[PDB]
Design an enzyme around this catalytic site. Structure first.
Site, PDB file in Angstrom:
ATOM      1  N   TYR A 244      31.781  54.667  30.703  1.00 29.15           N
ATOM      2  CA  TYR A 244      32.564  53.750  29.900  1.00 29.15           C
ATOM      3  C   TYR A 244      31.676  53.029  28.903  1.00 29.15           C
ATOM      4  O   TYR A 244      30.477  52.838  29.119  1.00 29.15           O
ATOM      5  CB  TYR A 244      33.297  52.740  30.779  1.00 29.15           C
TER       6      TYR A 244
ATOM      7  N   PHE B 163      37.995  49.768  25.579  1.00 33.69           N
ATOM      8  CA  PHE B 163      37.083  50.558  26.390  1.00 33.69           C
ATOM      9  C   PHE B 163      37.249  52.031  26.070  1.00 33.69           C
ATOM     10  O   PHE B 163      38.367  52.499  25.862  1.00 33.69           O
ATOM     11  CB  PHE B 163      37.341  50.314  27.883  1.00 33.69           C
TER      12      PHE B 163
ATOM     13  N   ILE C  43      38.846  45.148  37.092  1.00 33.42           N
ATOM     14  CA  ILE C  43      39.968  44.357  36.624  1.00 33.42           C
ATOM     15  C   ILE C  43      41.267  45.163  36.674  1.00 33.42           C
ATOM     16  O   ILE C  43      41.287  46.404  36.814  1.00 33.42           O
ATOM     17  CB  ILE C  43      39.727  43.823  35.203  1.00 33.42           C
TER      18      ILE C  43
ATOM     19  N   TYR D 210      39.542  39.358  32.158  1.00 30.42           N
ATOM     20  CA  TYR D 210      38.993  38.138  32.734  1.00 30.42           C
ATOM     21  C   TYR D 210      39.796  36.901  32.356  1.00 30.42           C
ATOM     22  O   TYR D 210      39.812  35.920  33.108  1.00 30.42           O
ATOM     23  CB  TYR D 210      37.536  37.984  32.299  1.00 30.42           C
TER      24      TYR D 210
ATOM     25  N   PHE E 130      29.779  45.023  24.468  1.00 33.74           N
ATOM     26  CA  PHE E 130      29.168  44.182  25.487  1.00 33.74           C
ATOM     27  C   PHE E 130      28.708  44.954  26.716  1.00 33.74           C
ATOM     28  O   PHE E 130      27.944  44.403  27.517  1.00 33.74           O
ATOM     29  CB  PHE E 130      30.144  43.085  25.926  1.00 33.74           C
ATOM     30  N   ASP E 131      29.141  46.201  26.890  1.00 36.26           N
ATOM     31  CA  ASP E 131      28.757  46.971  28.062  1.00 36.26           C
ATOM     32  C   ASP E 131      28.864  48.456  27.756  1.00 36.26           C
ATOM     33  O   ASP E 131      29.704  48.874  26.957  1.00 36.26           O
ATOM     34  CB  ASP E 131      29.634  46.624  29.269  1.00 36.26           C
TER      35      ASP E 131
END
Lengths: 387, 820, 375, 107
Positions: free
Chosen positions: D26, D99, D56, D82, D36-37
């Site tokens: 991912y 994502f 999540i 979140y 961010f990831d």
């Protein structure tokens, strides 16, 4: 009022006195028993005096008329007074030593002796260690006094504090005189402000407090650092720091030189900005490397954050903040989200300056101790936006 | 842009380097959560690529290296370094196998040392713990400061280790060629980051034996070849690189020391086995042979009547060879120890070519050559190099100072010891950071786990070596001093700070002595802690002094004067906290006077007997500062003790004079009870200071003078009046509801017990008329009341229990003694 | 319990191993004598490759020992509130102190030879800055007693033994050019801290040892702590030996500088401070006398504490003698106008009464001899 | 809300079931496009079990719709993500998440 006090007051300036013989010529002669003289307080310019109403006090020169302010040193309390000594041309006999001779101070006209008031009971309960000084007919046996020499540094600093206080208080008084009275299309209607003297005093004091160059050898650099820390502490204890803060506060109400001119005139409006920058630089010089002086800002840190945005002295205010944060952890433990956000807004509005990053880094760790709250606040408010 | 344009764009270079500084700062010193957050902005790929990027500026290269270390390695390295100083050796086959000198053809004593950092280490070091970086994980429902502390972000350590070795070798080779384009623009920027990474990884323990060998060959291949290339030490390097080299050499010297310690422990295992068997056989043979001789039988049996440590000392006292004959052990067992001692001296280099052939010679010659070659301008480097020189010249002293941190344990205690070590690491980490709620919770939980651990109680010397109590005290005080005058935060942590330290003194006398040594520090920190309720540093001091005559007699009059000054301040000024709470303003603080008084009581009264040395000092100090006695007992313009008690009772009845009278805590202070308890504590302390009778019969003037002073202070009529004062009794009324007294706000039998103790110890009961007078006035009524309360409803009432305690403890023994 | 004391074979191996470690430490490792100090000092004194350089001579690069002394002088001169404890500093100071002395009728030539060797070994240090480092660290200690100042004083004594006039001159020139009061301030504060006999401590120790509880670990009767009575006797003697060695050889310059420091803003009379300490000491000795006056025979600990006090008093007397010998007339007059007369009166009283009391029992003969030497 | 768009197709038959471990690569971006990831930077596939609530709500449901070998873009509203508190430092409050997910296999 005059007190016998012990502790840091010894190393402080307020404990400093100047002996002034009644003669101008050969006033530097060796002091002699029974020699009449005046005792001047350096930081205040006031003279030890006996007053019928308030007894022993320090009075102004205008009120010092040689009957209240005339004192002599006696080796013993006996009332000999057999013959008045003849004035001597030259240095004369070396009678009184530094730190060995025991001297009793006597007011010539009254003949009273300098002594303590024998603190009334419950003073021990107060834990008050200071003993009011009085003039009494008999006094006490222990009334004798050693005379201890002071460093040229301390004497100079006390005199400079006295003059600086007078000058800056006059400046402040003028500012208060035309605080709320616009001059319109006319003159400011008041006494001329001492802009040039204030500027020169500020420059001279910045040079006086300049830190030593790194090229210097370690020993001499350490000696200079001792001298500088001492001088900073003396100025702080005599209140120059608060005076600078007051001057800055009164100059800050005016956003710009034109706003200042509306009340003072263009002639002072030109020097407005130079003066504010000089004041901030002097503040930084006074507090740089002095943990106590930097800690004084824990009670009032908003005084700096509120001013960070101002354009005229941005770098000076930032340097002040940097010094405070490097020196004092107390400020760091009192930091708040509002402060951190203001500093970040400084980055946003004024540009990418690494000094703000250094300030934020100092917020995190002091003397090997980290502040998690400051760390997390900085992270949360700065990083995620990524702009 | 390409980040490489910052070679010419310098303002951007400075801004980004200081940004990296900020990244390191925010994650500094254990903020593993912030490290995880940073892992998003600066990813593993970025960091690893920057490590290898030759074209970066030196500032950015170093910043990225240090950022990697901070995010991933700093906490683990610090935690491991904390443990490295200690040597907890399990008794295992691995330990047994350990020898100072590897095996081979040459004799061990004369042999060439094994390679440092290579071999078997059995000393206990807790494992590293890491958490993967993930930002899609479910958000914990748990609140902030209550959630468990996060671990440092994980990175592939073996791959990082291989890359570090590879880059270091490449740097060595290229520095061999003297290129004009170093990575980072300088030999400094080329070497320092890699060396820092390598040192971190060594301390962390990632490197294996072969990797350590490669590192050693890089350092100096000729010395560390096991059975052309140029070494860093020959590369003529600048000072900072020399500093990193010195740190590496310090690691290797520490490993040699650790090997010495472990070899000594293994030899102790093997040799104690033989000594134990020999002692068993010798005791045995003595039993077969007691018949022939009695006296000389007695003399050998002196060995078995000796304590074990003295048995050890006797068995080992054969070094001089003049005590050989008196030493019972045989020559073979003696020779084993002699051989090991020679091997140890050789390994440490005491036993006495241009090429060094050893780490000690290499280090000494390198340091001397550096200093000869140039006048070093770095005081840190000077310190480090001369420290290394000292260690090489004095290896025996290094071991001698290290052993106190050495402890042998059974393998069966290993897991508990490791859990305790992790808890201690958490606590040690909490020193550097400022206290907060999360840190307080971690501290409390670690303390609880340690106290649940059985090893804590079984091995108190181990804890004392570890410095657990000292770290706890440092945390407590760091909390106390900060903002002390304004208010005391995190009180639960200080309460735990006893529960731990303040059972700690009870575990063992040696622990109690260790805390007694710190007593003064506790006392000077006590002043603020007084307002706090619960277990306090004053209680830690009481635990240090309690029931130990040695410690009490070693107690200092300076500490006593400090306590008395605190108590005088209490007797002169009220409690600002109570005033802020709105309590009626009186002139003094009974609540703190009471604590100081009971501390003094524990100081002066030990094991049922008074310590005159401290008692007389307390009396004299207290009379010199008589405001400690109270607004009563003052002298001029001072009401008596009995009137004080009566007024306190009236206060307790009247609110707006006992309290604010506008409690959730239910500990709300009652001024009448506070005053009565202060005076009772004072009377108890005076009675305890009172001389023991045998001195009085001996006619000792000091004892008589003290007793006369006490009698002058406290008249007997007042004691009798207080003992006669009625105590409210539970009653059943108005539908069968119990009307029942409140202890915290009422006169209680303990107040009477203090007076009884004073009367017995000072005045005494020698006349029948006075005995009967006391019985008819105060005692007998209370006994009748207790017996009346001896009913199903009233038997368990707190007042009935207090009456029974008062009777049994004070009254009934007195009547028994005065029975004739 | 003595019968129940478990034999060694019944203990778990780990406890027995720790006991073995402690015993082996005490008996073997500690007792072992290895001397590396002189070898270290020589290896650090030697300078290399300057012969091939041939300009580095004219450059005057410090050799390693000089650099180490400079490092420690840097640490001393650094401005800060307190002198931090430095085990490295104390270890190296001990090494240098050993290097100097490095040690039944003896030949005059041998005796001059020993003097010359000692002077060489002292030169190795004071040419490189050891005297100035000593003074700097004494000033830095700021009058707080500790191992740092103890090591510094031992180093000073080592370099000053024999009345080394060169070290003397260097110390004085440094002090007079720097015009710093911290040195003598620290000396005065250390003198004030220096202890005297305490009868309360003596009684407490006696009662403690009389109680004599067995230590919980094994059985240790009369477990001894640090001697509560004159724990700092070695420090006091070293301080006064250092002050004596300053003036050794009848160095009038020191003899007067100790009395008064003309250049400095303030001056301290070490002569009078010494007299004050002597007066406190004789008061303590007279009190301890009165404590033992009734009892026919003094016990062993009393003998010991008397010996300690008399050794301190002897060193103080020698320091006072050295202050005035030569003679130094100003110091003579200061003492004549001091309270040394009161001290002498008290000492004479104690001398006479102890002489009479100790003559009675032969077990007290050594203490009598020490007393007579002190008189 | 989870909103799934197929970048590349999978097999189209094999879909995750509860109690079945899903292995993914991912890459995470905020709606503005900031990343961010990413699991690929770590070079390690991310494994999670369905119904367990490790990940999540958005991941749960979106991967539930995917197929083995399928590559998809998942848009998740804050309420599945979140949300208001956010992920401090990483993710701001009230942030929509994008994502890019490749469902390698099921185990």
């Amino acid at each position: 009022l005059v007190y016998y006090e012990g502790g840091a007051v010894c190393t402080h300036a307020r404990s400093l006195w100047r002996l002034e013989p009644l003669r101008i010529s050969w006033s530097g002669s060796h002091l002699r028993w029974g020699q009449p003289l005046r005792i001047r307080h350096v930081t205040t310019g006031r003279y030890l005096a006996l007053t019928e109403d308030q007894g022993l006090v320090v009075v102004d020169a205008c009120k010092a008329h040689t009957k209240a302010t005339s004192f002599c040193f006696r080796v013993s309390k006996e009332k000999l007074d057999t013959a008045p000594k003849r004035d001597v041309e030259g240095m004369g006999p070396p009678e009184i030593k530094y730190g060995e001779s025991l001297c009793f101070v006597q007011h010539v006209a009254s003949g009273l002796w300098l002594t303590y008031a024998a603190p009334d009971p419950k003073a021990l309960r107060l834990g008050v260690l200071k003993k009011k000084a009085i003039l009494h007919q008999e006094g006490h046996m222990d009334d004798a006094l050693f005379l201890t020499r002071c460093q040229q540094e301390e004497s100079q600093a006390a005199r400079m504090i006295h003059s600086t206080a007078g000058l800056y208080n006059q400046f402040i008084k003028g500012l208060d005189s035309f605080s709320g009275k616009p001059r319109g299309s006319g003159p400011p209607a008041g006494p001329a402000l001492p802009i040039e003297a204030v500027i020169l005093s500020l420059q001279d004091l910045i040079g006086y407090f300049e830190p030593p160059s790194e090229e210097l050898q370690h020993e001499e650099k350490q000696s200079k650092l001792r001298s500088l820390r001492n001088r900073q502490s003396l100025f702080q204890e005599e209140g120059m720091l608060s005076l600078v803060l007051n001057c800055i506060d009164r100059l800050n109400v005016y956003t710009t030189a034109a706003h200042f001119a509306e009340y003072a005139g263009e002639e002072a409006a030109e020097s407005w900005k130079e003066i504010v920058n000089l004041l901030y630089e002097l503040l930084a010089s006074l507090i740089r490397g002095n943990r106590a002086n930097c800690a004084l800002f824990s009670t009032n840190l908003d005084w700096v954050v509120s001013k960070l945005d101002r354009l005229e002295a941005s770098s000076g205010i930032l340097e002040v903040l940097y010094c405070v944060l490097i020196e004092s952890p107390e400020v760091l433990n009192i930091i708040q989200e509002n402060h951190i956000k203001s500093i970040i807004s400084l980055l946003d509005k004024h540009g990418r300056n690494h000094k703000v990053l250094d300030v934020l880094c100092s917020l995190c760790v002091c003397n090997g101790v980290a502040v998690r709250s400051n760390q997390d606040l900085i992270t949360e408010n700065l990083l995620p936006g990524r702009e | 842009m390409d980040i490489l344009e910052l070679s010419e764009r310098l303002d951007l270079q400075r801004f980004h380097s200081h940004t990296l500084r900020l990244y390191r700062a925010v994650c500094a010193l254990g903020n593993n959560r912030v490290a995880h957050a940073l892992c998003s902005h600066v990813d593993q790929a970025q960091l690893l690529h920057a490590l290898e990027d030759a074209h970066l500026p030196g500032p950015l290269r170093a910043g990225y290296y240090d950022l990697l270390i901070s995010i991933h390695l700093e906490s683990a390295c610090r935690s491991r370094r904390s443990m490295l100083s200690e040597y907890i050796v399990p008794l295992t086959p691995e330990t047994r196998a350990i020898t100072l000198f590897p095996p081979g053809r040459k004799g061990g004593n004369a042999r060439r040392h094994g390679l440092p950092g290579v071999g078997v280490t059995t000393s206990l070091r807790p494992p590293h713990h890491f958490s993967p970086p993930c930002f899609v994980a479910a958000l914990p429902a748990a609140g902030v400061a209550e959630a468990p502390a996060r671990l440092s972000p994980a990175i592939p350590l073996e791959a990082l280790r291989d890359k570090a070795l590879r880059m270091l070798g490449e740097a060595v080779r290229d520095g061999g060629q003297h290129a004009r384009d170093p990575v980072g623009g300088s030999v400094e920027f080329q070497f320092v980051p890699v060396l820092k990474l390598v040192s971190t990884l060594l301390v962390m323990g990632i490197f294996g034996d072969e990797d350590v060998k490669q590192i050693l060959k890089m350092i100096e291949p000729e010395v560390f070849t096991e059975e052309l290339e140029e070494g860093l030490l020959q590369m003529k390097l600048p000072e900072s690189v020399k500093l990193q080299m010195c740190n590496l050499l310090e690691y290797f010297c520490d490993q040699e020391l650790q090997h010495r310690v472990e070899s000594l422990a293994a030899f102790a295992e093997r040799y104690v086995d033989k000594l134990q068997a020999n002692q068993r056989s010798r005791y045995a043979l003595l039993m077969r042979a007691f018949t022939m001789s009695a006296a000389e039988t007695a003399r050998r049996t002196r060995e078995f009547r000796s304590p074990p440590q003295e048995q050890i000392n006797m068995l080992l006292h054969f070094k001089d060879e003049a005590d050989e004959e008196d030493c019972p052990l045989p020559e073979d067992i003696r020779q084993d120890l002699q051989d090991f001692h020679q091997d140890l001296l050789a390994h440490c280099g005491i036993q006495l070519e241009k090429k060094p052939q050893s780490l000690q010679e290499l280090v000494s010659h390198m340091v001397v050559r550096w200093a000869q070659e140039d006048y070093v301008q770095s005081p840190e480097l000077v310190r480090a190099m001369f420290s290394l020189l000292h260690r090489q010249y004095d290896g025996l002293g290094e071991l001698l100072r290290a052993l106190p941190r050495a402890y042998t344990i059974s393998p069966s205690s290993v897991e508990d010891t490791m859990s305790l070590l992790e808890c201690l690491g958490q606590i040690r980490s909490l020193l550097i950071v400022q206290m907060g709620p999360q840190e307080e919770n971690l501290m409390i939980q670690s303390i609880g786990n340690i106290m649940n651990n059985k090893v804590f109680y079984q091995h108190p010397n181990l804890m004392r070596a570890l410095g657990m109590h000292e770290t706890v005290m440092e945390v407590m005080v760091n909390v106390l001093g900060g903002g002390e005058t304004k208010e005391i935060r995190f009180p639960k942590m200080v309460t735990s700070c006893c529960r731990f330290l303040c059972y700690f003194c009870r575990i063992s006398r040696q622990n109690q002595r260790s805390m007694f040594d710190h007593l003064s520090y506790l006392l000077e920190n006590s002043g603020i802690g007084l307002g706090m309720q619960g277990s306090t540093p004053l209680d830690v001091a009481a635990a240090s002094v309690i029931d130990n005559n040695e410690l009490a007699l070693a107690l200092q009059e300076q500490d006593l004067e400090k306590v008395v000054s605190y108590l005088a301040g209490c007797g002169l000024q009220s409690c600002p906290m109570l005033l802020a709470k709105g309590y009626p303003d009186i002139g003094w603080n009974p609540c703190g006077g009471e604590r100081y008084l009971d501390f003094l009581r524990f100081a002066v009264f030990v094991n049922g007997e008074s310590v005159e040395e401290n008692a007389n000092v307390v009396v004299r100090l207290l009379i010199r500062k008589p405001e400690c006695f109270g607004p009563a007992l003052r002298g001029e313009g001072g009401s008596g003790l009995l009137a004080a008690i009566e007024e306190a009772i009236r206060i307790s009845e009247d609110p707006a004079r006992d309290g604010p009278g506008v409690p959730p805590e239910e500990n709300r202070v009652h001024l009448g009870h506070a005053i009565m308890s202060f005076y009772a504590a004072l009377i108890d302390l005076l009675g305890r200071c009172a001389p023991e009778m045998h001195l009085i019969q001996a006619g000792k003037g000091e004892a008589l003078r003290i007793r006369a002073i006490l009698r002058s202070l406290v008249p007997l009529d007042d004691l009798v009046g207080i003992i006669s004062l009625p105590l409210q009794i539970p009653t059943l009324g108005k539908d069968g509801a119990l009307v029942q007294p409140k202890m915290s706000a009422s006169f209680v039998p303990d107040h009477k017990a203090s007076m009884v103790l004073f009367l017995d110890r000072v005045y005494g009961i020698e006349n029948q008329d006075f005995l009967l007078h006391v019985l008819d006035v105060g005692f007998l009524p209370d006994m009748r009341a207790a017996a009346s309360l001896d009913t199903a409803t009233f038997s368990t009432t707190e007042m009935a229990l207090a009456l029974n305690r008062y009777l049994c403890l004070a009254v009934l023994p007195l009547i028994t003694k005065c029975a004739p | 319990a003595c019968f129940r004391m478990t034999p060694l074979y019944n203990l778990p191996t780990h406890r027995a191993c720790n006991m073995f470690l402690e015993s082996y430490k005490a008996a073997w490792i500690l007792t072992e004598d290895h001397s590396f100090e002189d070898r270290m000092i020589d290896d650090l004194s030697k300078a290399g490759e300057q012969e091939e350089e041939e300009e580095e001579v004219e450059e005057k690069k410090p050799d390693p020992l000089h650099q180490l002394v400079l490092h420690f002088s840097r640490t001393a001169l650094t401005e800060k509130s307190k002198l931090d404890e430095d085990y490295l500093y104390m270890a190296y100071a001990d090494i240098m102190a050993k290097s100097c002395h490095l040690e039944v009728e003896v030949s005059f030539e041998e005796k001059e030879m020993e003097k010359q060797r000692l002077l060489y070994q002292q030169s190795r240090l004071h040419t490189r800055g050891a005297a100035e480092m000593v003074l700097q660290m004494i000033s830095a200690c700021k009058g707080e007693t500790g191992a740092m100042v103890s090591s510094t004083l031992k180093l000073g004594i080592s370099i000053l033994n024999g009345g080394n006039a060169e070290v003397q001159q260097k110390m004085l020139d440094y002090l007079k050019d720097k015009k710093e009061v911290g040195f003598f301030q620290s000396i005065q504060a250390l003198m004030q801290t220096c202890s005297v006999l305490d009868l309360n401590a003596f009684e407490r120790q006696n009662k403690a040892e009389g109680l004599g509880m067995v230590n919980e670990d094994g059985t240790v009767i009369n477990r001894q702590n640090g001697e509560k009575v004159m724990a700092d006797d070695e420090f006091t003697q070293d301080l006064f030996r250092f002050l004596q060695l300053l003036c050794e050889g009848h160095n009038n310059d020191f003899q007067n500088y100790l009395r008064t420091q003309t250049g400095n803003t303030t001056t301290i009379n070490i002569i009078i401070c010494t007299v004050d300490y002597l007066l406190r000491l004789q008061e303590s000795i007279s009190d301890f006398y009165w404590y033992y006056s009734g009892k026919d025979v003094i016990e062993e600990q009393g003998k010991r504490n008397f010996s300690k006090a008399m050794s301190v008093a002897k060193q103080v007397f020698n320091s006072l003698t050295e202050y005035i010998q030569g003679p130094c007339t100003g110091n003579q007059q200061s003492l004549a106008h001091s309270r040394l007369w009161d001290a002498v009166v008290g000492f004479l009283h104690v001398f006479a009464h102890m002489m009479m009391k100790l003559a009675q029992d032969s077990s007290q003969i050594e203490l009598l001899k020490e007393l007579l030497d002190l008189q | 809300g989870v909103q799934v768009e197929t970048i590349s197709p999978g097999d189209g038959r094999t879909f995750p079931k509860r109690g079945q471990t899903c292995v993914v690569h991912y890459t995470g971006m905020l709606e503005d496009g900031k990343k961010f990831d990413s699991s690929r930077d770590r070079n390690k596939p991310f494994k999670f079990m369905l119904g367990k609530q490790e990940v999540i709500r958005g991941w749960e449901e979106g991967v539930a719709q995917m197929s083995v070998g399928q590559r998809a873009k998942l848009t998740i509203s804050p309420d599945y993500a979140y949300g208001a508190t956010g992920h401090p430092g990483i993710i701001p409050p009230h942030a929509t998440l994008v994502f890019d997910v490749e469902l390698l296999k099921l185990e």
